Subunit: 402 residues, 4 copies
């Protein structure tokens, strides 16, 4: 196919040289991220079962999840939950296949629980949380589905939407991403079971100076007094330092739980390891983009990838693809300092035929856009030709969407 | 004396970028219905707290789920089969000292009043269920006053961030003003078949623009396909008029591109919103505070809708950044483009940000030196008056989506 | 057909001669009665629309409705509701017919609202209540349904259950019944708009002495202070007095809102006219029997008639039928002092073929069971043959089920 | 210490000499019984923990439980649950005690799920059920509670409440009760794990002939084809015949799962062993009275005992009390053929001082009422003196309420 790809130079200062860079990440126990990961765990568990029974992922979109805050009162040595966290699953999934029922609600509720067990280790999943499903019923005749799939080997776009992604990551980006990932590793979680999964990380660079703030819920059953807690914070400090030192020679101030105040009793302790116990809410699409970050020095799509199907929904598929394409361009094409990729769907045309795939590149010093633009074009075109590979990448947990 | 830093922005302006992408979700789109309900509830609660106690009490209603119903649209008039379900959450104050405040009554009325105006053909009594899980809260009023008196200007406890720009490009204005006119009272009186679920996408490449409009058509206003086709024409003509007032670039306009007549497929609905079957919605998934979704620009992830207008730093800074950029673009001769970013200083009042970066591309022939001073000044005046935002919000004088 | 009717004498003292008789009625704004009423409104609205669309009532049972109490703060001149009443509709109904979707939830929610407007006049239906439906889905194919109607003209029984009814009503029962229906008549609500619909009426007769206690919610917006509130109770009192005098010669004490304690500022005032605003809950089947009363001197079925379908559910149909058989016997057969009727279904046989229809009679003095048994028998047999007349009686609002 | 207890002769034919008798029981895994059981489980759990923490039972009522049928696809060898059972807990309880907090929802959720794990053994509580809580809030001052308690050690009635019990049980009553109870016993479940807990038993006696019908959900993972199924029904038949033969010499037909139609492939087959799995619904107070039975030949209260406050809810206390008193008089006083006990509260007064406690005795042949009066009066007066023992019986699981 001749595809609508456009490669242009982007004239601005590269982000490493911009004076003020702000990067955020919401970790895996943060209420918005809990919603994202449930939304996605439901889509994937549904998708796997549809493939198991019928060979093919049937239509669904479970990109709507509300995390409604409970009430709890932590205390050194072990506080308690008073009102449970209430989670609602919605979106839509095929449940009537010909005349038979597919167990959408059973699958969805089990995936949600299974995902939470691993996202918030200290949450009692039977007594601190209620999870209900209001996932909409769709219907399909299976012969119609296969016929439509024979007619269009690359699925048709259902919506007019764009995805966006860029590469490579900056030092501040890499520090932020890796700091939350390290702190929420299974590995680290076995060394310090006081560290809850609700970790927000913020990285603010002014010039060559970086402030890295970590806000991390401590679990009160694992810390019997302010001193145990203070030792926990220090271990978070030392964690972060070795990530910071692996990533920059810039001088860096690290802060943990800045709101604390020993005098007035104030410490960031929680019964469960998420602030969703205390009345903070979450919902899908309010947090990390598909590269795992929130990055106002860069660009983004407002489409929420989590929970959307990986077969036809470009709000997931073109966010993923834009990141993959930007990444291969930054890595494979000498001369690229930065690259931003933006893809807009053409409703009723195949998802590999977008209205545009806009690639915008800042050359390294010395390089002309003219030598960059052919190899950038080819990478983008080849990924577009192979767009249906994102289905399996999703089924096999090979890419993240938040 | 504030950390405002006005410097030049050394970049090709957006108009000279080759590809520009801009989207707006109109008022009856399910994500915007969610955003709108959220902010409606916030504003309702706010006017009632002030009326009763002289002060806005803490709330945040930035959590609204729109779960799609079922419907069978039909030329001549269809029916709703299962009602739309909408959940209100977040939290607010219902105990003030020894008195009680009817949080849930205010929210249900504000939500249902907001939908009545947002989706004109939705039957509120029968096509919708609104459920509240708005969380509880308790306040001692005197203590609240004594914090307000201690700090007239609220203290940050955070590094929160806001970003805004001006002026709008051609393509931005076309997209914004196309949806607004299609959902205007004037237009609805002439063509009441045009529903409020209108999503508009603008793509520019060089000097060619493609504008696509997906507008839910109301099935009781359209007796058959020729009636429907005439409505699409009138959308097309209305957009063409707005396009021509904004640009000389050749522009193609496409309306309801998913339509497939020979298969019987038309964008008709019973109520005028896809929430009735085809779509779910939720808060902070659509338009930013300037009403647009703009991947060529820098955007914040903050969901402004429903956030506390008195102390939510992110809401207030996102609004402020937009107001400051606008005024600079409008007031200062020689501004081609301006971005404002504002970053709070934890502990310090919100009118003393860590930094307020104003970055300007001069129009040709102008130098940054003749722009610096008046820009600094405009930015300082607004920061000084940061508590003004709270009363713009109450008075319905600024939008958050 | 030959049916399993057994008529026998009941040897005991008639209720009018028993020493201690207790009767109770929950009026229409009482939370348990709001549940029954809503259950039955939903079933009737569904039934009416199945008939309109298809000729025939399709299967449903909406005999599950929870009224979950709100919170409110009444005060003279007008209080406020803080948390709304929350009402869940449950049960099941056919929603797919020939792959086509019938608007179960639209009909149910509207019927609930419509019933509540009427049942609690001062309740704000959009801001003081939330109504949600979890009514379960069923499916049918219409040819299948007509072929089965064809084949079984009297529908088959799906359960093994009994109904129970009796006649005639004692003085005490008539007073209790008529006292609540008068105080909740439209006529009287025009005359005294302060009187809420949550009226509980109890009649306790000891020998030839009756204590009639009324508990009636007063609506706080039509009563400006305690003296307006005392006038209203005196109007209630005087109403009851006329009903009492119309029905008995026994001396009778009448008490209205006995928990009132003016000295401590306690008065039964409400914002809406139902106690469901203040946290009293209701559910279906917890109150009045089909004859409108709770009568421990008599006998009853534990089946809840309200919301159950009137085509095949004997848990409704045998409670209605028993009342009707018992009433016609007591009225038409001279010499019947009392008659009690109990009917037990035979699962998978026609509803007019019960396992037993037991009739128990107390003769008037001088009359022998021997001359009562044949006409009692015939009345029962006739009504069993005419059992399907209960459908139209329900559709046309000719009988009450609470 | 002088109470208004009145012993008199009941001049009536005893129930064994009536021609028709009808007795039903809903067993443990039936949806109405699930609801009653969960209600009372949550109350007792709440109570034990209030006692633990504060040395007294704080106010609650959890007599409101809605069991909304799921979807299932039963099959010989092992079927599938398609959509979870949804259970709504309502009522109210105290979560604020002075400046402290009490975890009402965590105790209720755990007690409910624990109750179910016992009640329906093949139900998977993590995947086949959702338990939602709308239990209402409440606040107390603990010295306020103790002062009230110290002042009125026997709690004061606030209205006229009523309870009725009778004894002894008839042959048919004991057959119905013991049949369900043996079929749901540990012992029998061990030997025949194919027998689910959803068992409803109906006994009909006409004269000296009894028909006993047992409807028992059979679990499909335990039964590979219809001959294994039939063998299970045979085992049910035979365990019932044993119960029957030890209780009566009257000839008795036993019927098991009468709805079955092998020619058409219809068997009472389930995945979990309760009909709640497939759209059949349940709620509180729609089933057995506190003696475990539904007895239309008898006088019954409409009170829903399950989940009511065991310190101050008087209808609950008086229906328990009634039954225990009638029982003791039956068992201890030579000459009692049949005995009814009714207790009516005295509005102003402590509940051990009722308006009346009516004890009505049919003497066995040859015995005179006046040899029965005194021992009956003593037993009744002794229990009314010991009204607080019921509280402790409830908390120690030594009485049932359905």
């Amino acid at each position: 196919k001749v595809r609508n790809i456009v490669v242009e130079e982007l004239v601005r200062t590269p982000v490493e040289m911009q004076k003020v860079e702000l990067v955020e990440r919401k970790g895996i126990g943060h209420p918005d991220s809990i919603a994202d990961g449930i939304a996605e765990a439901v889509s994937r568990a549904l998708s796997r079962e549809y493939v198991k029974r019928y060979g093919i992922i049937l239509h669904h979109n479970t990109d709507q999840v509300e995390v409604v805050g409970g009430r709890a009162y932590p205390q050194f040595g072990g506080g308690e939950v008073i009102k449970p966290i209430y989670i609602l699953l919605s979106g839509r999934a095929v449940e009537m296949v010909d005349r038979e029922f597919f167990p959408v609600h059973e699958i969805a509720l089990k995936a949600a629980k299974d995902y939470l067990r691993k996202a918030v280790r200290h949450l009692d999943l039977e007594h601190h949380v209620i999870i209900d499903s209001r996932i909409g019923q769709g219907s399909v005749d299976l012969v119609g589905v296969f016929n439509k799939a024979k007619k269009n080997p690359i699925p048709l776009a259902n919506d007019t939407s764009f995805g966006v992604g860029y590469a490579p990551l900056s030092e501040t980006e890499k520090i932020v991403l890796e700091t939350e990932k390290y702190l929420n590793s299974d590995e680290f979680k076995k060394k310090y079971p006081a560290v809850g999964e609700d970790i927000k990380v913020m990285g603010l660079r002014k010039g060559d100076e970086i402030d890295l703030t970590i806000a991390a819920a401590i679990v009160d059953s694992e810390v019997d007094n302010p001193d145990d807690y203070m030792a926990v914070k220090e271990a978070i400090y030392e964690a972060a330092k070795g990530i910071v030192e692996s990533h920059t020679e810039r001088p860096t101030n690290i802060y943990v739980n800045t709101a604390d105040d020993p005098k007035e009793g104030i410490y960031y302790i929680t019964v469960t390891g998420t602030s969703a116990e205390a009345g903070d809410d979450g919902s899908v699409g309010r947090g990390n983009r598909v590269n795992g970050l929130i990055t106002p020095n860069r660009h983004m799509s407002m489409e929420a990838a989590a929970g959307k199907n990986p077969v036809s929904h470009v709000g997931k598929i073109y966010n993923i693809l834009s990141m993959l394409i930007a990444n291969d361009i930054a890595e494979q094409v000498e001369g690229v300092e930065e690259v931003y990729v933006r893809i807009l769907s053409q409703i009723g045309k195949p998802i590999d035929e977008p209205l545009v795939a806009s690639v915008q590149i800042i050359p390294k010093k010395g390089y002309s856009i003219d030598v960059l633009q052919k190899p950038a074009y080819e990478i983008a075109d080849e990924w577009l030709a192979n767009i249906t590979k994102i289905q399996k990448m999703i089924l096999e947990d090979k890419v993240n969407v938040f």
